[PDB]
């Protein structure tokens, strides 16, 4: 590419980042802004592990 500043859009350089989340079968890894919140037992509950 010979990029030049006086190029019409669609010929100017774009930077690209491709995030690819993979989950082969690990036991746990990165996440997001969770909360932890304690747990319980013996009660019908709505859970996320």
């Amino acid at each position: 590419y010979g990029f030049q500043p006086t190029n019409g859009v669609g010929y100017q350089p774009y930077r690209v980042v491709v995030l690819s989340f993979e989950l082969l079968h690990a036991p746990a890894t990165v996440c997001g802004p969770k909360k932890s919140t304690n747990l319980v037992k013996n009660k019908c509950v709505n859970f996320n592990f």
């Binding site: 082969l24 079968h25 690990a26 036991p27």
Partner: peptide, 24 residues
């Protein structure tokens, strides 16, 4: 030389627990 395996080279195809289950 060459030799004969008999029943060798079986690995767990992945995580996920499992019990008595003739899984295919």
């Amino acid at each position: 030389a060459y030799t004969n395996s008999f029943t060798r080279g079986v690995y767990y195809p992945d995580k996920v627990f499992r019990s008595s289950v003739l899984h295919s």
